[PDB]
Design a protein around this ligand. Structure first.
Ligand SMILES: C[C@H]1COc2c(N3CCN(C)CC3)c(F)cc3c(=O)c(C(=O)O)cn1c23
Ligand SMILES: [Mg+2]
Ligand SMILES: [Mg+2]
Lengths: 479, 546
DNA sequence: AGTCATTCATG
DNA sequence: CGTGCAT
């Protein structure tokens, strides 16, 4: 009927249970592919369903429902909001979901509910899933024990640094900003060649974050500090021009703001400064951003000290903010503050992946080569093979007779005996061409397996392709 | 001659009239035995026969609302019967005689046989005529309830009922305290049976009282072994005794705040029985349904108000708790005239249960699957505020917290009485997931920080099967092996939720017990406190990532 | 189809 | 205060 437990014990089996899960399976990105579980499931499920960049948009609610019923046992709001975020190009440096309809704005207005919008994976998101069908990554059973899901994606580009992550669990939080794809890939490529590379040298390739929202990042040494330790405070400041209006008045024009800042709240707080006259000078605040351009006009009064006003806004609004690195990711099942262990785990991961992919393709190529070898043989001996099957009592007896009389293996016997009659109309040469192409294919793969360097070259070759395909810096760097 | 205006003698009906002359005959034969076994029988015929252990015609006389050959001129049954056969065994012979319709004698009273010595006994069997009666079908259920409730005050007598149609039977005998049990048989019980005896100048009053979780009060009264269906001065003496004896008990070392009535009678059931000397006996008009005799009010109020000012002082358990109940009754009552969570139907802080359920959704199934008599439902909507991290300002401005502080009814903090509570068990019912774990954690810390006594008196609990025949352990499924795996209660129907986790017969509740206050205080304050580093380390040290 | 509030960590 | 998965 009733069993006692201590207050001290209850709060222990519970908070441990929760803590472990929120850290491993909710708030924190995997260090290799840079995804939280909800995002990986989103991408995996839409890809399983062929809802890719090259096909028609599919209703958001259909996608969300499948994710919920197959992989992610939580609310649809959370899944949908997560899916929507991965589509907002002012939050993601390289968006992974393309969404048709109101998916929000820099002003932070609610996205349309998932009954209105429609979505599909972006082309680049395709590269996170590249080769997932090739047994390249470890799979587990879903919540449901009905279906397998991937525990990490193949990640043909370094999404952790490219898109970023944030980041609140139990005992740990994470803030990793976005970086330029070409830059991050240049760094990875250097490190592949020079594994013991030092930060100073890596920063010749990867000078610092690259926000989708652009702006100005100030703090070379804190950037360095963060690349070494995973923690660091940098300054992020709006791009600003001044315009000399008629009649001796000036006007400050903002055109890029700090990452994660709500444009509309910022505009209101700057106008609050004007309405309250905390500092003198501001004539009018005017948000002039249209569908193709961000532009805020802070018109000044005649004989207004524009440097004073600007500086004050920089300090007392989010016209300028501090951005704090707190690079935490999940490495070998546990939370790590990390650059060296991060990159190295990733590199070891790609190694396992590429090795596994190659075993898989080689296996396929061999099974085939083995059959093609049997068929080449069969042709030297058709008339008597048809005779033999003619004399067999049934399928199983026919296979047996093919093994016993002509040494075919089971697998070859199965193939031979399940051929359609029309095949008997058919040339050993075509087959020999195939036999040769398979042998070459197997040699390439077997090398990769027996020798690491061939594999790392492939990985660099593929990362460079991704870079060539997917843009220039947005955020300027300043000492 | 009574045949002509039958309602006057009986109040004819269908068949309340038919069931009225049987009352008359039975009460008559009782009255006769009083001055030791009456047996009634419904026959296959349809006829009814009352017999008992010149007794004869003093017996067949009826219209008989009392207790405490010769005639046969106006036996109101004889007049109202198809035939009526009558038989007496007396002195050493047995005599029979029967009549038809009006009561015109079909034969003379003759000796129809030899009787076993001087042994005496009287018997009347009759069939009402279907002329003056519209229903001739005696109901055994009704006759039963009569004979039953009759036999309580009739200590001298035992009476039986046999239905030869349905071949069933009872018998009744009672050696006023039992009556309150009989009255509260299938009900739940706030106080035990209180019994107060006493003589006081001629009058003999004898009362038992016993509260239930019910609402309607239920007070029966008896003067001189018969019922005063309409109450009377003795009743007013009894009611006026409690409302003023308990008010005193409140006023004194209890609770009154200085500066109620029928609120004391909510769920009160009581059987009250006085003996009046008959020369002082006076009722209202025509019928002896309402005692009017003035002295009865201050003698019953005497005897009762005395004994239970003693009883109340005698044990502050069933006492101050009982008063509080009156004020909860006083509270909503005046809040109904001011009307011009899902609560348990009846208020019983001794068996009542409060269910804090994670989510309005699960809250729904809880409301539907519950036993509404003693189980209340409180849906918590969202994660509960962390009562360690937040300020006692914001903590008290929280809906989930604020309404538990109210629904529980004991206040909070050091201004907190565990006796003004509302439940014997507060039960936390969450999802069997990680977030349910989290929720249990935030509620436990609130109850510890702000209602420690409730957790200290082992009042706080925590409520499902893992497998489907059901099993909870990985071991219990292998014993069944000689399979569906439950992912949530949502895969829960109200039916299943009950059988499995809410039913006090088929459920398992972990009972929170504050064992080592000091190492318990370290645990809450480290897991839920403002400081992150302690927690992080507790996790790093105790949490097996692998 | 918006709106309301709460956890968790951090500067 | 605001962030984003959770309730
Ligand atoms: C689980 C429920 C709990 O209640 C919720 C809210 N309230 C909490 C109680 N408050 C007194 C009133 C507001 C809320 F404001 C927002 C949400 C919400 O966005 C949400 C979701 O599924 O996305 C789900 N829920 C919400
Ligand atoms: Mg929501
Ligand atoms: Mg749940």
């Amino acid at each position: 009927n009733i069993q006692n437990m201590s207050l001290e014990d209850i709060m222990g089996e519970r908070f441990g249970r929760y803590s472990k899960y929120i850290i491993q399976d909710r708030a924190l990105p995997d260090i290799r592919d840079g995804l939280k579980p909800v995002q990986r499931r989103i991408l995996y499920s839409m890809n399983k369903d062929s809802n890719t960049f090259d096909k028609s948009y599919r209703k958001s609610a259909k996608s969300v429902g499948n994710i919920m019923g197959n992989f992610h046992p939580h609310g649809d709001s959370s899944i949908y909001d997560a899916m929507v975020r991965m589509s907002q190009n002012w939050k993601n440096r390289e968006i992974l979901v393309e969404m048709h309809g109101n998916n929000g704005s820099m002003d932070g207005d609610p996205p349309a509910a998932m009954r209105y919008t429609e979505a599909r994976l972006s082309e680049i998101a395709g590269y996170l899933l590249q080769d997932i069908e090739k047994k390249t990554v470890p799979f587990a059973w879903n919540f449901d024990d009905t279906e397998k899901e991937p525990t990490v994606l193949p990640a043909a580009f370094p999404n952790l640094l490219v898109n970023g992550s944030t980041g609140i669990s139990a005992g740990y939080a994470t803030d990793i900003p976005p970086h330029n794809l070409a830059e991050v890939i240049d760094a990875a490529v250097y490190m592949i060649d020079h594994p013991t590379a030092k930060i100073d040298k890596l920063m010749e390739f990867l000078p610092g974050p690259d926000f989708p929202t652009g702006a100005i990042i100030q703090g070379r040494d804190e950037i360095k500090k963060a690349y070494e330790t995973g923690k660091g405070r940098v300054v992020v400041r709006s791009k600003t021009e001044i315009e000399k209006l008629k009649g001796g008045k000036e006007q400050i024009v903002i055109t890029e703001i700090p990452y994660e800042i709500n444009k509309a709240n910022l505009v209101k707080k700057i106008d609050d400064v004007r309405v309250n006259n905390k500092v003198a000078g501001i004539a009018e605040v005017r948000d002039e951003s249209d569908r193709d351009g961000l532009r805020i006009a802070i018109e000044l009064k005649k004989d207004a000290n524009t440097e004073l006003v600007l500086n004050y806004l920089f300090k007392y609004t989010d016209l300028q903010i501090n951005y704090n690195f707190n690079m935490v990711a999940i490495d070998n099942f546990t939370p790590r503050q990390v650059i060296v262990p991060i990159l190295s785990s990733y590199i070891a991961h790609r190694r396992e992946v590429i090795l596994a992919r190659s075993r898989f393709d080689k296996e396929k190529a061999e099974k085939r080569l083995h059959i093609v070898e049997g068929l080449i043989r069969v042709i030297s001996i058709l008339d008597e093979v048809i005779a033999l099957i003619r004399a067999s009592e049934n399928k199983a007896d026919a296979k047996e007779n093919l093994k016993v009389s002509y040494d075919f293996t089971e697998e070859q016997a199965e193939a031979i005996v399940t051929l359609q009659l029309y095949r008997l109309t058919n040339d050993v040469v075509v087959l020999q061409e195939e036999e040769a192409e398979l042998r070459e294919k197997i040699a390439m793969l077997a090398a990769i397996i027996g020798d690491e360097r061939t594999m790392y070259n492939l990985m660099k070759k593929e990362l460079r392709e991704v870079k060539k395909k997917f843009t220039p810096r947005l955020s300027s760097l300043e000492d | 001659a009574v045949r002509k205006r039958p309602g006057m003698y009986i109040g004819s009906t269908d068949g309340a009239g038919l069931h009225h002359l049987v009352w008359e005959i039975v009460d008559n034969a009782v009255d006769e035995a009083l001055s030791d076994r009456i047996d009634v029988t419904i026959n296959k015929d349809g006829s009814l026969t009352v017999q008992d252990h010149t007794v004869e015609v003093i017996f067949t006389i009826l219209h008989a609302g009392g207790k405490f050959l010769h005639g046969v001129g106006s036996s109101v049954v004889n007049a109202l019967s198809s035939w009526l056969e009558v038989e007496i065994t007396r002195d050493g012979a047995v005599y029979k005689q029967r009549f038809e319709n009006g009561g015109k004698p079909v034969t003379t009273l003759k000796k129809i046989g030899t009787a076993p010595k001087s042994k005496t006994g009287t018997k009347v069997t009759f069939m009402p005529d279907a002329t003056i009666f519209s229903t001739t079908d005696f109901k055994y259920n009704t006759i039963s309830e009569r004979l039953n409730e009759s036999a309580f005050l009739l200590k001298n007598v035992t009476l039986s009922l046999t239905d030869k149609r349905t071949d069933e039977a009872i018998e009744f005998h009672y050696e006023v305290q039992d009556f309150v049990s009989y009255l509260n048989e299938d009900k739940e019980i706030l106080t035990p049976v209180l019994y107060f005896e006493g003589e006081d100048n001629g009058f003999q009053v004898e009362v038992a009282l016993q509260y239930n979780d019910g609402f309607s009060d239920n007070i029966l009264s008896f003067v001189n072994n018969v019922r005063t269906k309409d109450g009377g001065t003795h009743e007013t003496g009894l009611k006026s005794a409690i409302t003023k004896v308990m008010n005193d008990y409140a006023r004194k070392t209890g609770l009154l705040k200085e500066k109620e009535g029928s609120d004391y009678r909510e769920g009160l059931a009581a059987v009250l029985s006085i003996l009046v000397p008959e020369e002082h006996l006076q009722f209202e008009g025509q019928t002896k349904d309402k005692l009017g005799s003035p002295l009865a009010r201050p003698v019953v109020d005497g005897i009762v108000a005395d004994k239970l000012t003693f009883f109340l002082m005698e044990n502050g358990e069933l006492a101050s708790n009982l008063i509080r109940k009156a004020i909860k009754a006083r509270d909503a009552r005046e809040a109904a005239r001011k009307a011009r969570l899902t609560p348990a139907q009846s208020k019983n802080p001794a068996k009542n249960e409060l269910y804090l359920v994670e989510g309005d959704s699960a809250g729904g199934s809880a409301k539907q699957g519950r036993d509404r008599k003693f189980q209340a439902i409180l849906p918590l909507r969202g994660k509960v505020i962390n009562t360690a991290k937040a300020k006692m300002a914001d903590i008290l401005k929280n809906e989930e917290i604020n309404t538990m502080i109210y629904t529980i009814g004991a206040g909070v903090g050091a201004d907190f009485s565990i006796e003004d509570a509302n439940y014997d068990k507060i039960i936390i019912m969450t999802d069997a997931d990680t977030d349910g774990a989290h929720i249990q954690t935030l509620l436990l810390t609130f109850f510890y920080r702000y209602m420690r006594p409730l957790v200290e008196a082992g009042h706080v609990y925590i409520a499902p099967p893992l497998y489907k025949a059901y099993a909870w352990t990985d071991g219990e499924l292998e014993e069944l092996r000689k399979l569906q795996r439950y992912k949530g209660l949502g895969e829960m129907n109200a039916d299943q939720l009950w059988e499995t986790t809410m039913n006090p017969e088929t459920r398992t509740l972990i009972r929170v017990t504050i064992e080592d206050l000091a190492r318990a205080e370290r645990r809450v304050n480290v897991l839920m406190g403002d400081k992150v580093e302690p927690r992080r380390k507790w996790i790093e040290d105790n949490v097996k990532f692998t």
